[PDB]
Ligand binder design. Structure first.
Ligand SMILES: [Zn+2]
Lengths: 155, 102, 38, 559, 280
């Protein structure tokens, strides 16, 4: 897939910065990271907060934020960038995101690629996703596959 | 004929008003710029300055001056200096980094 | 008819006066701009 | 049947073809001037200027003889210059739609140490230039090429070509493609994307396009995109007059100097030719008050677009800006006089420009030379006394080994402008009948942006309108007819190549200068009769008064 | 082959310029140096958002003056604060030597460019930066193969790269032969300018404080006496005007004294009476 001139940003992801809050121990953060049927599930409630850092600064164009069809796919996502400190759910709800995202149903499918405002993502070091709600309004949310499409800034 | 001349007169008058307002605004801004330029010229006369001897006047704005560092320099005379006060071997203060006869 | 002529002559004298005024303003601005440029 | 013929006329195919034939037939360019200039070029800047000047001289003549002769010298150009060179090709073949794709096939791509993506981008740009304002067919091809374009330079060239082709059509698909390219947020492609957004949605007053473009200009960080978007915002609000006012204020107050420059350009495009005194007041206030020199310059430039309908009033207002201490204001004054009195040969404007050609600041000299060329285009010694002198001046600046590089660049482009289109085209922001020629206004405005991007200079090719009187029969063909110009032949003659009766007979088509149009009638012995009075000029239908068989003017081939 | 455009600019932030000037002066007469942080936005832009000084070493300014521990720890802890900007380039001070790059300067700049092709080597003269003008330039390099082959170091596409003329002092020290000057633009937003405006923003008080009235009277006396002498000179000069066809002015000095008198006394009067009527 992916638009011409871009690449999957998987090899540029630094595992030292990755950190997901409210995840069930049985459903690890790597499940959403990996392109398998394995999924990441929130453990406390629907809200989730996943921070991913990169080895080198990168520029994002589109995200593949997809989950299952049972309605537990995300629906409202606040994206913050270059966070100098770990993110708190209270502030994340309060804070103004770099980009707000109302994930329609079609995004959650396997062919769902969500374009991002490339203007605001030109010096991304670490990207934090605050999943505020899910489609089915369940007590928890599942993410089948999450990744980023973009290009390195060639540091 | 008559109406065309009258309309041309009105258009010309309005354009004259526009030019007048333009010129007044530019006059104000030019006065500000002149003040800044005078400030800069005065600031170039700050301290320290190296003493030298006004050896010879070459042009209305350029002279040859013997700076007491022991060296002769062809430098530029500042306008505000009284020309009649510029006599040979007179002691003159020169800009430290440019030797301009300050 | 003659009303046209009265309006025309009044505007003509006004335009002449303002043209002299504009020329004077231009001379003043020119001298100030010359000072600034120098 | 006859309705199809008027459809053909309205689509522009017939008029463009006739203009192309007129330009080819009366190609009178002196290649010796270009030979001298190519002899006196040392650096790459003068090389690019020479390419552009040759393009201007042969604009629409399809005569690339200079390039074919000096291919070895042309190969010296690399990187963007090479791009510009290829782009220049499109100006030479202006209106040569029929073979365009095919002929661009002859300049087929290769692989070398430069990416040759400059060549592909220049090819797309030239394709757009050829079909400028008339891209009815090329649009789909350029859309496909831009969509499939991968390189950044190719994207830039394709965006420029697409904007030129789609100029004023305001099609939504092309706007979406160009907005996508703009959102890709690359400095090289940003200029082209913003300029093409302006070109496509030109004069449309669209709220969506303008909000997208202003928001992007306030959101991005690449200044090249800022300049492109500035000119684009100007173009979108072209000719809308007071409907621009809101936007204008929203751009005059903005903190970003490029956005303020966009506000000045929007004042120019919105009130182009109206002479609205509120616009002039605002422009003069900005030109004398603003803290960023580029904004002051652009503010002075916009005066030409405001006042081109009353050129006699233009030196009166710009003369004092001409002497201003600020060199940027001086350049703005020069090019404002150039735009304002373009193709008129105004005496006062040239007298104002004459001292400017010796200004200490180099780019001021460049602007003065460019503006003089714009003013005196097609002019002769009798019509304009000083023209010869300026001609010598140009050569001197080229042959002065110590003169600064941009003084030389201005001189080269001035030589190109003065003999544009084989001395068969002029710069007329007004139309023949008194309408604001929108392609001319857009082309001149974008040409003024050569200060920021040299390949944009070819946009001035839009302003080249042929000075012709094309007589047509009832069948729209061209009978062999002669018109009598009641003036001394040297009054409007071509310049003498480098090394009398009171009337002249001109064949069909006739290279008639706009001033010569007044004194031109047609002999009574002619079996035809002009339908519209000949003094107006342009493509004029001739009614045949006799049933004798017609002798048609044979169509000359290309190149 | 790609060529660096002559329109490329170095956008130095206000804070970066101030820190650079302060550090350059603080080390006079030694040559101090430090690292400029920022980002290469595009092919025509190099943004210097911030610059941190580096400890002085007896070496001087060389590629051995960048202590790896200092640089690494400073970068890490700035990133902690919120400034995760890459090392765009380096700066050092040539006190009174003008702006240029010496052989060792060219050497360290080669070292920096090996890290990233885009990298600037701005230098600042801290003693030539007298109030008003600021003597600072930014140079990258020219590849030797680029110059020997005869091709120009930088492609040109606009007049931006030639608005300013190179200096003779830089030119003899290798300018346009081994390194090219890059135009420098200062990124000053409204907020920073307004904050800097407080340096000489007088007060809400001195708009209302009258001059020392005895001092005011003495100043008036002195200026009026000077104006009397000037009036005598003006009369003497004007008498000469008659017996003189078109062929310091006691008048210009007279006008200046008049202007200073009217401004001083008008201001003093108005301030005094505003004070009388706003304070009961
Ligand atoms: Zn050094």
């Amino acid at each position: 897939d992916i638009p011409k001139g871009y690449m999957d940003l998987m090899p540029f992801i630094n595992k030292a910065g990755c950190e997901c809050l409210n995840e069930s121990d049985e459903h690890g953060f790597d499940n959403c990271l990996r392109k398998d049927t394995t999924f990441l599930e929130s453990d406390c409630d629907e809200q989730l907060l996943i921070t991913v850092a990169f080895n080198q600064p990168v520029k994002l164009y589109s995200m593949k934020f997809q989950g299952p069809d049972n309605g537990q796919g995300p629906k409202y996502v606040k994206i913050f960038i270059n966070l100098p400190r770990s993110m708190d759910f209270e502030e994340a709800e309060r804070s103004e995101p770099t980009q707000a995202l109302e994930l329609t149903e079609d995004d959650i499918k396997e062919d769902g690629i969500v374009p991002l405002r490339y203007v605001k993502f030109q010096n991304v070091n670490s990207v934090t996703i605050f999943v505020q709600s899910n489609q089915g309004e369940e007590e928890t949310t599942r993410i089948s596959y999450f990744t980023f499409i973009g290009t390195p800034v060639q540091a | 004929d008559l109406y065309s001349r009258y309309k041309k007169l009105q258009q010309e008058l309005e354009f004259l008003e526009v030019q007048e307002e333009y010129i007044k605004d530019e006059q104000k801004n030019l006065k500000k710029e002149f003040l800044h330029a005078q400030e800069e010229v005065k600031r170039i006369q700050s301290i320290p300055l190296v003493i030298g001897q006004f050896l010879e006047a070459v042009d209305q704005n350029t002279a040859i001056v013997g700076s007491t560092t022991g060296s002769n320099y062809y430098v530029r005379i500042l306008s505000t200096i009284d020309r009649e006060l510029l006599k040979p071997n007179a002691s003159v203060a020169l800009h430290k980094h440019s030797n301009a006869l300050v | 008819r003659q009303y046209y002529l009265s309006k025309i002559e009044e505007l003509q004298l006004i335009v002449n006066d303002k043209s002299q005024n504009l020329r004077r303003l231009q001379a003043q601005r020119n001298e100030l701009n010359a000072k600034v440029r120098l | 049947n006859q309705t199809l013929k008027m459809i053909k006329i309205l689509s522009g195919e017939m008029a463009i073809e006739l203009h192309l034939q007129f330009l080819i037939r009366n190609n009178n360019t002196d290649l010796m001037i270009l030979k001298n200039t190519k002899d006196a070029v040392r650096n790459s800047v003068c090389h690019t200027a020479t390419v552009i000047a040759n393009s201007f001289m042969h604009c629409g003549t399809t005569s690339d003889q200079f390039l074919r002769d000096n291919l070895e010298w042309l190969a010296r150009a690399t990187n963007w210059a090479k791009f510009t060179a290829t782009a220049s090709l499109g100006v030479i073949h202006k209106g040569h739609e029929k073979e365009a794709l095919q002929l661009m096939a002859t300049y087929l791509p290769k692989d070398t140490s430069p990416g040759s993506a400059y060549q592909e981008g220049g090819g797309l740009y030239a394709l757009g230039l050829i079909h400028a304002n008339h891209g009815g067919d090329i649009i789909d091809y350029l859309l496909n090429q831009l969509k499939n374009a991968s390189n950044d330079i190719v994207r830039h060239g394709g965006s420029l070509g697409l904007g030129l082709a789609a100029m004023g059509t305001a099609r939504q698909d092309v706007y979406d493609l160009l907005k996508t390219n703009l959102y890709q947020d690359d400095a090289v492609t940003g200029e082209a994307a913003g300029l093409a957004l302006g070109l496509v949605m030109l004069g449309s007053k669209n709220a969506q396009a303008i909000e997208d473009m202003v928001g992007y200009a306030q959101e991005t960080q690449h200044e090249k995109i800022l300049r492109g978007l500035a000119v684009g915002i100007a173009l979108v609000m072209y000719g809308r007059m007071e409907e621009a006012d809101a936007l204008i204020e929203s751009l005059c107050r903005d903190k970003d100097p490029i956005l303020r420059r966009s506000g000045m350009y929007t004042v120019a495009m919105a009130y182009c030719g109206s002479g609205n005194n509120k616009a002039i007041r605002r422009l003069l206030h900005v030109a004398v008050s603003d803290v960023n020199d580029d904004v002051r310059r652009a503010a002075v430039e916009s005066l030409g677009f405001i006042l081109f309908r009353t050129p006699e009033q233009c030196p009166s207002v710009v003369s004092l800006l001409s002497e201003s201490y600020n060199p940027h204001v001086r350049y703005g004054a020069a090019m404002a006089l150039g735009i304002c009195c373009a193709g008129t040969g105004n005496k006062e404007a040239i007298n104002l420009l004459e001292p400017m050609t010796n200004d200490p600041v180099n780019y001021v000299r460049q602007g003065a030379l460019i503006a003089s060329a714009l003013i005196m285009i097609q002019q002769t010694e009798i019509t304009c006394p000083k023209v010869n002198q300026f001609r010598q001046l140009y050569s001197k600046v080229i042959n002065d080994k110590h003169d600064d590089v941009m003084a030389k660049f201005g001189a080269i482009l001035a030589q190109g402008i003065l003999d544009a289109g084989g001395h068969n085209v002029t710069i007329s922001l007004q139309s023949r009948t008194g309408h604001t020629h929108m392609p001319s206004v857009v082309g001149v405005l974008v040409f003024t942006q050569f200060w920021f991007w040299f390949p944009l200079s070819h946009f001035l090719s839009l302003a080249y309108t042929p000075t012709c009187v094309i007589g047509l029969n009832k069948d729209l063909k061209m009978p062999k007819v002669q018109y009598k110009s009641n003036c001394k032949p040297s009054t409007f003659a071509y310049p003498a190549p480098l090394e009398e009766p009171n009337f002249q007979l001109l064949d069909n088509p006739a290279r008639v200068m706009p001033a010569q149009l007044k004194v031109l009638t047609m002999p009574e012995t002619c079996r035809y009769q002009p339908f519209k009075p000949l003094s107006i000029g342009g493509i004029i239908i001739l009614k045949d008064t006799s049933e004798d068989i017609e002798e048609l003017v044979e169509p000359v081939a290309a190149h | 082959a790609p060529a660096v455009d002559t329109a490329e600019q170095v956008y130095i932030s206000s804070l970066a310029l101030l820190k650079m000037l302060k550090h350059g002066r603080a080390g006079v007469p030694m040559e101090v140096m430090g690292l400029m942080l920022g980002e290469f936005v595009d092919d025509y832009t190099v943004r210097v958002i911030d610059v941190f000084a580096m400890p002085q070493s007896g070496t001087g300014v060389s590629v051995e003056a960048v202590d790896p521990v200092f640089q690494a720890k400073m970068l890490d802890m700035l990133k902690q604060t919120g400034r995760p900007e890459m090392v765009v380039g380096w700066y050092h001070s040539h006190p009174g030597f003008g702006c240029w790059l010496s052989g060792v300067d060219i050497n360290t700049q080669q070292s920096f460019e090996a890290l990233s092709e885009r990298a600037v080597a701005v230098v600042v003269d801290p003693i030539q930066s007298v109030k008003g003008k600021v003597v600072i330039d930014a140079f990258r390099l020219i590849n030797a193969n680029m110059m020997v082959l005869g091709h120009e170091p930088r492609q040109t596409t606009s007049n931006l790269g030639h608005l300013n003329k190179p200096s003779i002092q830089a030119l003899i020290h290798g300018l346009n032969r081994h390194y090219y000057s890059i135009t420098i633009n200062y990124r000053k937003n409204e907020l920073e300018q307004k904050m800097l405006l407080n340096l000489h923003k007088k007060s809400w008080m001195e708009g209302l404080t009258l001059q020392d009235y005895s001092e005011h009277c003495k100043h008036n006396e002195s200026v009026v006496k000077e104006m009397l002498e000037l009036a005598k000179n003006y009369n003497k000069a004007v008498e000469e005007e008659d017996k003189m066809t078109p062929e310091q002015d006691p008048k210009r000095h007279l006008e200046e004294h008049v202007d200073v008198l009217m401004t001083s006394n008008i201001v003093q009067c108005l301030a005094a009476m505003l004070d009388t009527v706003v304070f009961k």
